[PDB]
């Protein structure tokens, strides 16, 4: 027939408009479309097309003209296909039921989608993750009353009462309405939508009424999270007898936990709200069905009540960031057969760990008891049971004493071990080398003595080793060369010795290296320049010597460094007041630790308290090009000259080379450091003129050139007049404002 002849010519005309011909190489003319990649056929007729995740780079007009008009096309999946432009009127086939145009660059007002009404059989529509918007006053309607599923999420839709617009010409067929990640406000009325099962209006701008649900006859999923909502949500959902998931998290709800529909409830989040009081006993009605609970980030208190024993289907229990107290309720927890994640972090649970915690090692994937007032030892009998399924053990920021148990090596599935901010003595057990799946070993601010275990070489998966603020001794073990995936090594404030080993260059994923306040010696290895991800090098307060090698900056302009983002951190900035406090600032790991317990550092660290504290979840700025961001090598015995390659790092914020024996002049290339905020070159033997090229630097917030033998006039252009005299003092030959006038 003509429809076969039409089908092949339409498909091939689509191929021909594509900028890249190679995307559909098997598509060709005079060949059966049912043999093509992307095509589904039933009885030798095209029924579905799937060109998802292929960079087609074509407008919607090409899709509508060629593909959506094909006779008998039932579904068209073009998610992440690099389609742009706008929807408008076209001839749509009557058989088309599903259309996925998610994750594209579609633009224009959201009223453009009304022209999809041509598709008389359209039931499923996904235009999420596009750039659609709603300019001005909201009037008319979407007029796609035949849809069972509509996903308009993660657009640029900004407006009041956009939900009434979607639902204006009826919603009797609508089963799933998702419109999250927009800036929608106003009223949400879904009372006429009597078959609605799924409602997601989350991450929006609703600060008014709770959505009115009517009889709520079919509603199983209700997500109103990430808004500014308050008021009587209890009354609004009380008729919702079928409700399985209720996520009201990240809102302004207050008071105690009110009555809920419990009989079918599986997931409940009241997290990040302003809720108060104790967990009421009426939540026992959820225990036949409750799979997940989240009461994190509220002002709850008391104990976990004993009804949770009956909640035997409960997989995750998150009671984080509240004021829960008492001993660890093991009689309740051991009865929860289903429990896989236990998150009791940022509370005031107290006493020693009960012996019966050993039993939950074989069932839990995650145990988080961080930031609590737990005392006594870590249980040596943990992971005594065979088949220990435990992946994450977070015990940081407690009052734990004694040794790190070697028997922790029996948790063979363990990916993260965080035992920081405790009072732990003894050695880091050699048996932790056995943890063959371990990525994160964080033991900082304890009293750990001994050497760093050579046997850590057997941990092939090790990504972070955070051992700051301990009483550690010996050299860096050569075994750490074997751990090739290391991206964050931090051994500061110990009594470690030896050289930075030359094999450090073999660590290709290494981003952050912090070795400050130790007795490390010898030359700075040129092999640090072989590290193709290194953005943060802090070596301050050590006994390093020799010349700064030119070769360490060879990666400048070549670094791609976007593996380390997602990890929480803290940057405690130094202020130039205390002579005992050294360095620009301590970048430190900070997952699951309260900033209020940073006062614990005071007895180990001379640097003030938290003069400038930044807690901001990591995350490097650049993409394709890249360079080192932070370079502190202060308070060592470094000699020779600063090489001219020091100015080859455009992303360098901080450069502290202070308190060394560095001679020659300040290279002119320093003016190329366009991203530089801080430049400490003080207490060296630098001589000659401050180069005029440094006047091009526009972003210096701090500078220090004092205690050198610099001469001539201070540059009058740029930022030098901003800085006080003290930053240029003890430079006998140096003159010009802020210092006195240069007289010949
Ligand atoms: C490098 O690390 C060493 C050792 O941690 C630091 O020395 C320590 O500095 C702290 C804070 O100044 C001292 O704590 C003090 O303890 C006394 C009582 O002993 C107390 O009265 C003070 O109020 C303060 O809490 C600690 O004694 C001291 N330890 C040693 C072994 O000297 C040093 O300051 C750090 N250096 C840098 C550059 O950060
Ligand atoms: C840089 O330092 C190293 C290591 O020695 C440090 O300084 C010494 C004076 C002493 O205090 C050690 O305990 C320190 O660890 C120097 O290495 C040796 O230094 C000696 C002189 O003391 C010299 O005779 C050796 O040949 C050097 N070599 C060995 C093989 O250790 C190194 O010379 C210093 N470099 C510079 C440029 O000063
Ligand atoms: C849709 O995106 C494509 C992909 O770049 C755009 O096509 C080219 O864009 C560059 C941008 O500088 C133009 O100079 C070319 O002339 C464009 N080529 C063609 C064939 O159009 C396209 O302009 C985008 N369309 C819309 C409506 O934004
Ligand atoms: C309950 O709602 C919260 C808050 O909206 C969800 O957590 C967010 O998940 C989105 C992805 O859709 C992220 O972009 C946000 O960063 C998360 N926010 C927070 C505060 O964590 C959470 O996933 C929901 N839970 C369920 C089971 O649906
Ligand atoms: C959210 O809505 C309020 C009230 O209509 C409005 O003033 C505000 O600009 C909106 N915020 C955003 C982020 O769109
Ligand atoms: C948290 O609970 C403890 C222990 O009962 C109590 O002493 C403390 O005052 C509570 N915290 C707050 C902020 O109310
Ligand atoms: C560590 O690396 C060395 C040198 O590449 C290799 O011969 C040795 O077998 C490795 N050891 C382990 C335990 O992986
Ligand atoms: C590096 O490349 C990125 C690509 O996103 C670009 O934004 C930036 O302009 C380049 N760096 C600088 C300093 O210009």
Short mmCIF file of N, CA, C and O in Angstrom, two decimals, residues 125-204:
data_model
loop_
_atom_site.label_atom_id
_atom_site.label_comp_id
_atom_site.label_asym_id
_atom_site.label_seq_id
_atom_site.Cartn_x
_atom_site.Cartn_y
_atom_site.Cartn_z
N UNK A 125 1.88 11.61 28.28
CA UNK A 125 2.71 12.78 27.81
C UNK A 125 3.77 13.12 28.86
O UNK A 125 3.45 13.22 30.02
N UNK A 126 5.03 13.18 28.47
CA UNK A 126 6.15 13.50 29.41
C UNK A 126 6.93 14.63 28.65
O UNK A 126 7.57 14.36 27.59
N UNK A 127 6.85 15.88 29.17
CA UNK A 127 7.63 16.99 28.60
C UNK A 127 8.44 17.59 29.69
O UNK A 127 8.73 18.74 29.65
N UNK A 128 8.88 16.80 30.63
CA UNK A 128 9.65 17.20 31.74
C UNK A 128 11.07 17.45 31.40
O UNK A 128 11.56 17.01 30.39
N UNK A 129 11.77 18.14 32.29
CA UNK A 129 13.09 18.61 31.98
C UNK A 129 13.24 19.28 30.61
O UNK A 129 14.13 18.99 29.85
N UNK A 130 12.38 20.26 30.37
CA UNK A 130 12.49 21.17 29.25
C UNK A 130 12.62 22.63 29.80
O UNK A 130 12.80 22.80 30.97
N UNK A 131 12.59 23.61 28.92
CA UNK A 131 12.53 25.04 29.33
C UNK A 131 11.19 25.73 29.01
O UNK A 131 11.21 26.86 28.63
N UNK A 132 10.05 25.06 29.18
CA UNK A 132 8.71 25.64 28.94
C UNK A 132 8.37 26.58 30.06
O UNK A 132 8.79 26.34 31.21
N UNK A 133 7.58 27.62 29.76
CA UNK A 133 7.23 28.63 30.83
C UNK A 133 5.78 29.08 30.80
O UNK A 133 5.03 28.53 30.00
N UNK A 134 5.38 30.01 31.67
CA UNK A 134 4.01 30.58 31.61
C UNK A 134 4.14 32.06 31.77
O UNK A 134 4.23 32.54 32.89
N UNK A 135 4.18 32.79 30.64
CA UNK A 135 4.32 34.22 30.73
C UNK A 135 2.95 34.88 31.02
O UNK A 135 1.94 34.63 30.33
N UNK A 136 2.94 35.73 32.04
CA UNK A 136 1.79 36.50 32.36
C UNK A 136 0.66 35.74 33.01
O UNK A 136 0.86 34.64 33.62
N UNK A 137 -0.53 36.36 32.88
CA UNK A 137 -1.79 35.92 33.48
C UNK A 137 -2.19 34.53 32.94
O UNK A 137 -2.05 34.22 31.74
N UNK A 138 -2.67 33.70 33.85
CA UNK A 138 -3.05 32.32 33.57
C UNK A 138 -4.57 32.32 33.23
O UNK A 138 -5.43 32.55 34.08
N UNK A 139 -4.88 32.04 31.97
CA UNK A 139 -6.26 32.01 31.44
C UNK A 139 -6.38 30.82 30.46
O UNK A 139 -5.37 30.31 29.96
N UNK A 140 -7.62 30.43 30.14
CA UNK A 140 -7.91 29.32 29.19
C UNK A 140 -7.71 27.95 29.85
O UNK A 140 -8.11 27.67 30.98
N UNK A 141 -7.02 27.08 29.14
CA UNK A 141 -6.76 25.73 29.65
C UNK A 141 -5.79 24.96 28.77
O UNK A 141 -5.50 25.34 27.66
N UNK A 142 -5.22 23.90 29.31
CA UNK A 142 -4.37 22.99 28.52
C UNK A 142 -5.17 22.20 27.46
O UNK A 142 -4.61 21.97 26.41
N UNK A 143 -6.45 21.87 27.72
CA UNK A 143 -7.34 21.18 26.76
C UNK A 143 -6.84 19.80 26.26
O UNK A 143 -7.00 19.45 25.11
N UNK A 144 -6.18 19.06 27.15
CA UNK A 144 -5.77 17.69 26.92
C UNK A 144 -6.44 16.86 28.05
O UNK A 144 -5.77 16.28 28.93
N UNK A 145 -7.77 16.89 28.00
CA UNK A 145 -8.62 16.15 28.92
C UNK A 145 -8.58 14.63 28.73
O UNK A 145 -8.98 13.96 29.68
N UNK A 146 -8.12 14.13 27.57
CA UNK A 146 -7.90 12.69 27.34
C UNK A 146 -6.68 12.05 28.02
O UNK A 146 -6.56 10.85 28.01
N UNK A 147 -5.78 12.83 28.61
CA UNK A 147 -4.54 12.28 29.21
C UNK A 147 -4.79 11.53 30.50
O UNK A 147 -5.48 12.04 31.37
N UNK A 148 -4.19 10.33 30.61
CA UNK A 148 -4.07 9.59 31.82
C UNK A 148 -2.83 9.96 32.63
O UNK A 148 -2.88 9.91 33.88
N UNK A 149 -1.73 10.32 31.97
CA UNK A 149 -0.48 10.68 32.64
C UNK A 149 0.13 11.93 32.02
O UNK A 149 0.32 12.01 30.82
N UNK A 150 0.41 12.92 32.85
CA UNK A 150 1.03 14.18 32.41
C UNK A 150 2.20 14.50 33.34
O UNK A 150 2.03 14.52 34.54
N UNK A 151 3.37 14.70 32.77
CA UNK A 151 4.52 15.04 33.52
C UNK A 151 5.07 16.35 32.95
O UNK A 151 5.60 16.34 31.79
N UNK A 152 4.92 17.47 33.71
CA UNK A 152 5.38 18.80 33.27
C UNK A 152 6.48 19.31 34.18
O UNK A 152 6.77 20.45 34.22
N UNK A 153 7.12 18.41 34.90
CA UNK A 153 8.10 18.68 35.89
C UNK A 153 9.36 19.26 35.34
O UNK A 153 9.70 19.03 34.23
N UNK A 154 10.07 20.02 36.17
CA UNK A 154 11.39 20.49 35.88
C UNK A 154 11.37 21.29 34.60
O UNK A 154 12.27 21.23 33.78
N UNK A 155 10.39 22.15 34.52
CA UNK A 155 10.33 23.23 33.51
C UNK A 155 10.66 24.61 34.15
O UNK A 155 11.07 24.70 35.31
N UNK A 156 10.44 25.67 33.40
CA UNK A 156 10.53 27.06 33.92
C UNK A 156 9.17 27.69 34.06
O UNK A 156 8.99 28.83 33.74
N UNK A 157 8.21 26.95 34.56
CA UNK A 157 6.82 27.38 34.63
C UNK A 157 6.70 28.14 35.93
O UNK A 157 6.83 27.62 37.02
N UNK A 158 6.32 29.41 35.82
CA UNK A 158 6.26 30.33 36.97
C UNK A 158 4.92 31.05 36.92
O UNK A 158 4.61 31.65 35.93
N UNK A 159 4.12 30.95 37.97
CA UNK A 159 2.73 31.34 37.89
C UNK A 159 1.80 30.88 38.99
O UNK A 159 2.02 29.89 39.56
N UNK A 160 0.75 31.63 39.24
CA UNK A 160 -0.30 31.29 40.15
C UNK A 160 -1.41 30.52 39.41
O UNK A 160 -1.73 30.85 38.23
N UNK A 161 -1.95 29.50 40.09
CA UNK A 161 -3.06 28.73 39.57
C UNK A 161 -2.83 28.05 38.22
O UNK A 161 -3.75 27.93 37.42
N UNK A 162 -1.61 27.60 37.98
CA UNK A 162 -1.27 26.87 36.77
C UNK A 162 -1.89 25.45 36.87
O UNK A 162 -2.14 24.86 35.86
N UNK A 163 -2.06 24.90 38.08
CA UNK A 163 -2.72 23.64 38.21
C UNK A 163 -4.20 23.69 37.77
O UNK A 163 -4.66 22.79 37.06
N UNK A 164 -4.94 24.72 38.13
CA UNK A 164 -6.32 24.90 37.62
C UNK A 164 -6.35 25.05 36.11
O UNK A 164 -7.33 24.68 35.48
N UNK A 165 -5.28 25.59 35.52
CA UNK A 165 -5.18 25.70 34.06
C UNK A 165 -4.99 24.35 33.39
O UNK A 165 -5.52 24.10 32.31
N UNK A 166 -4.18 23.48 34.00
CA UNK A 166 -3.95 22.18 33.48
C UNK A 166 -5.27 21.43 33.47
O UNK A 166 -5.58 20.73 32.49
N UNK A 167 -6.03 21.58 34.55
CA UNK A 167 -7.22 20.77 34.79
C UNK A 167 -8.51 21.47 34.41
O UNK A 167 -9.56 21.22 35.03
N UNK A 168 -8.48 22.35 33.43
CA UNK A 168 -9.58 23.35 33.33
C UNK A 168 -10.73 22.74 32.56
O UNK A 168 -11.87 22.89 32.96
N UNK A 169 -10.39 22.03 31.47
CA UNK A 169 -11.38 21.37 30.62
C UNK A 169 -11.57 19.88 30.97
O UNK A 169 -11.90 19.07 30.12
N UNK A 170 -11.37 19.54 32.24
CA UNK A 170 -11.67 18.22 32.78
C UNK A 170 -10.42 17.40 33.10
O UNK A 170 -9.35 17.64 32.50
N UNK A 171 -10.60 16.49 34.09
CA UNK A 171 -9.56 15.56 34.56
C UNK A 171 -10.11 14.20 35.05
O UNK A 171 -9.54 13.55 35.95
N UNK A 172 -11.19 13.74 34.43
CA UNK A 172 -11.82 12.46 34.80
C UNK A 172 -10.97 11.23 34.43
O UNK A 172 -11.09 10.22 35.03
N UNK A 173 -10.11 11.36 33.44
CA UNK A 173 -9.23 10.34 32.99
C UNK A 173 -7.86 10.38 33.68
O UNK A 173 -7.07 9.46 33.59
N UNK A 174 -7.54 11.43 34.39
CA UNK A 174 -6.14 11.68 34.78
C UNK A 174 -5.77 10.80 35.96
O UNK A 174 -6.43 10.84 37.03
N UNK A 175 -4.73 9.98 35.78
CA UNK A 175 -4.28 9.07 36.84
C UNK A 175 -3.04 9.55 37.49
O UNK A 175 -2.88 9.36 38.69
N UNK A 176 -2.16 10.19 36.74
CA UNK A 176 -0.84 10.63 37.25
C UNK A 176 -0.53 12.07 36.79
O UNK A 176 -0.45 12.31 35.57
N UNK A 177 -0.46 13.00 37.77
CA UNK A 177 -0.11 14.42 37.54
C UNK A 177 1.12 14.76 38.31
O UNK A 177 1.15 14.72 39.53
N UNK A 178 2.17 15.06 37.59
CA UNK A 178 3.42 15.39 38.21
C UNK A 178 3.76 16.73 37.58
O UNK A 178 3.77 16.83 36.33
N UNK A 179 4.09 17.73 38.45
CA UNK A 179 4.43 19.06 38.03
C UNK A 179 5.45 19.65 38.92
O UNK A 179 5.38 20.86 39.19
N UNK A 180 6.43 18.84 39.34
CA UNK A 180 7.39 19.33 40.31
C UNK A 180 8.48 20.10 39.70
O UNK A 180 8.66 20.08 38.53
N UNK A 181 9.23 20.84 40.52
CA UNK A 181 10.44 21.58 40.02
C UNK A 181 10.15 22.74 39.08
O UNK A 181 10.79 22.93 38.10
N UNK A 182 9.13 23.46 39.39
CA UNK A 182 8.68 24.65 38.69
C UNK A 182 8.57 25.76 39.79
O UNK A 182 9.18 25.58 40.86
N UNK A 183 7.89 26.88 39.49
CA UNK A 183 7.65 27.95 40.46
C UNK A 183 6.18 28.30 40.46
O UNK A 183 5.79 29.45 40.38
N UNK A 184 5.40 27.27 40.66
CA UNK A 184 3.95 27.33 40.63
C UNK A 184 3.45 27.65 42.03
O UNK A 184 3.92 27.11 43.00
N UNK A 185 2.42 28.47 42.12
CA UNK A 185 1.84 28.90 43.42
C UNK A 185 0.32 28.86 43.32
O UNK A 185 -0.26 28.62 42.24
N UNK A 186 -0.34 29.06 44.43
CA UNK A 186 -1.76 29.17 44.34
C UNK A 186 -2.51 28.02 44.94
O UNK A 186 -1.98 27.34 45.81
N UNK A 187 -3.73 27.85 44.45
CA UNK A 187 -4.65 26.79 44.80
C UNK A 187 -4.33 25.52 43.94
O UNK A 187 -3.87 25.55 42.77
N UNK A 188 -4.52 24.38 44.57
CA UNK A 188 -4.49 23.04 43.86
C UNK A 188 -5.82 22.30 44.20
O UNK A 188 -6.01 21.82 45.33
N UNK A 189 -6.75 22.27 43.25
CA UNK A 189 -8.01 21.56 43.44
C UNK A 189 -8.07 20.29 42.49
O UNK A 189 -8.12 20.41 41.28
N UNK A 190 -7.99 19.10 43.07
CA UNK A 190 -8.07 17.83 42.33
C UNK A 190 -9.29 16.99 42.80
O UNK A 190 -9.29 15.77 42.69
N UNK A 191 -10.34 17.66 43.29
CA UNK A 191 -11.56 17.03 43.78
C UNK A 191 -12.40 16.46 42.64
O UNK A 191 -13.08 15.46 42.87
N UNK A 192 -12.42 17.11 41.47
CA UNK A 192 -13.11 16.58 40.28
C UNK A 192 -12.34 15.45 39.63
O UNK A 192 -12.88 14.67 38.92
N UNK A 193 -11.04 15.38 39.86
CA UNK A 193 -10.16 14.29 39.33
C UNK A 193 -10.32 13.00 40.12
O UNK A 193 -9.47 12.65 40.86
N UNK A 194 -11.44 12.32 39.99
CA UNK A 194 -11.83 11.18 40.85
C UNK A 194 -11.00 9.86 40.64
O UNK A 194 -11.05 8.96 41.48
N UNK A 195 -10.24 9.72 39.56
CA UNK A 195 -9.39 8.56 39.32
C UNK A 195 -7.90 8.89 39.53
O UNK A 195 -7.05 8.09 39.18
N UNK A 196 -7.58 10.03 40.13
CA UNK A 196 -6.18 10.45 40.33
C UNK A 196 -5.53 9.60 41.39
O UNK A 196 -5.98 9.58 42.58
N UNK A 197 -4.46 8.94 40.98
CA UNK A 197 -3.68 8.07 41.86
C UNK A 197 -2.43 8.72 42.34
O UNK A 197 -2.01 8.47 43.46
N UNK A 198 -1.78 9.48 41.47
CA UNK A 198 -0.45 10.10 41.75
C UNK A 198 -0.49 11.65 41.60
O UNK A 198 -0.93 12.17 40.58
N UNK A 199 -0.12 12.36 42.64
CA UNK A 199 -0.05 13.83 42.65
C UNK A 199 1.33 14.28 43.21
O UNK A 199 1.66 14.00 44.35
N UNK A 200 2.13 14.89 42.37
CA UNK A 200 3.42 15.44 42.73
C UNK A 200 3.50 16.94 42.38
O UNK A 200 3.63 17.28 41.21
N UNK A 201 3.35 17.80 43.38
CA UNK A 201 3.44 19.22 43.23
C UNK A 201 4.60 19.77 44.02
O UNK A 201 4.62 20.93 44.37
N UNK A 202 5.63 18.98 44.15
CA UNK A 202 6.74 19.30 45.03
C UNK A 202 7.74 20.24 44.37
O UNK A 202 7.70 20.53 43.19
N UNK A 203 8.70 20.69 45.16
CA UNK A 203 9.70 21.70 44.72
C UNK A 203 9.07 22.83 43.85
O UNK A 203 9.43 23.00 42.69
N UNK A 204 8.12 23.53 44.44
CA UNK A 204 7.39 24.60 43.80
C UNK A 204 7.42 25.85 44.75
O UNK A 204 8.33 26.01 45.56
#
